[PDB]
Amino acid sequence: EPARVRCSHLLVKHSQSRRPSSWRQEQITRTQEEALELINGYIQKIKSGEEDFESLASQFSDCSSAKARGDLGAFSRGQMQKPFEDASFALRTGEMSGPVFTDSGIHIILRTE
Numbered sequence: 001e002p003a004r005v006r007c008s009h010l011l012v013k014h015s016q017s018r019r020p021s022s023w024r025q026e027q028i029t030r031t032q033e034e035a036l037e038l039i040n041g042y043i044q045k046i047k048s049g050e051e052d053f054e055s056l057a058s059q060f061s062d063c064s065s066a067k068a069r070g071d072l073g074a075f076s077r078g079q080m081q082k083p084f085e086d087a088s089f090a091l092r093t094g095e096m097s098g099p100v101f102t103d104s105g106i107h108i109i110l111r112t113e
């Protein structure tokens, strides 16, 4: 394990997220059940090749990271929410997580460095 990893991510918020608003939608109205459907449907399109992960993150991620195509940069442990941190460090570079639940919402993660 390295001291830091670099990941991109796509976040789908829901109405019970920590902050139920984003850059692309002033009030998040969708249920967590609908947030996961989207996450799972993004995963299948990324696996089929129909969709590109960073194109999707730049259009639909409810996180400000979307303006950088999903990239967060490099981070060590002790910084992000534990579920995101653990999931990110359990990835090989170039590997894409399944769903990841944090207080912010539901995440797909892709380790790059």
Ligand SMILES: *c1ncc([N+](=O)[O-])c(N(CC(C)(C)C)[C@@H]2CCS(=O)(=O)C2)n1
Binding pocket: 063, 064, 065, 066, 072, 080, 081, 084, 102, 104, 107
């Ligand atoms: C979304 N876009 C950017 C970004 N960031 O600036 O790193 C985050 N972010 C970190 C902050 C705490 C907002 C600085 C996420 C918070 C939830 S997370 O653990 O998935 C990382 N989010």
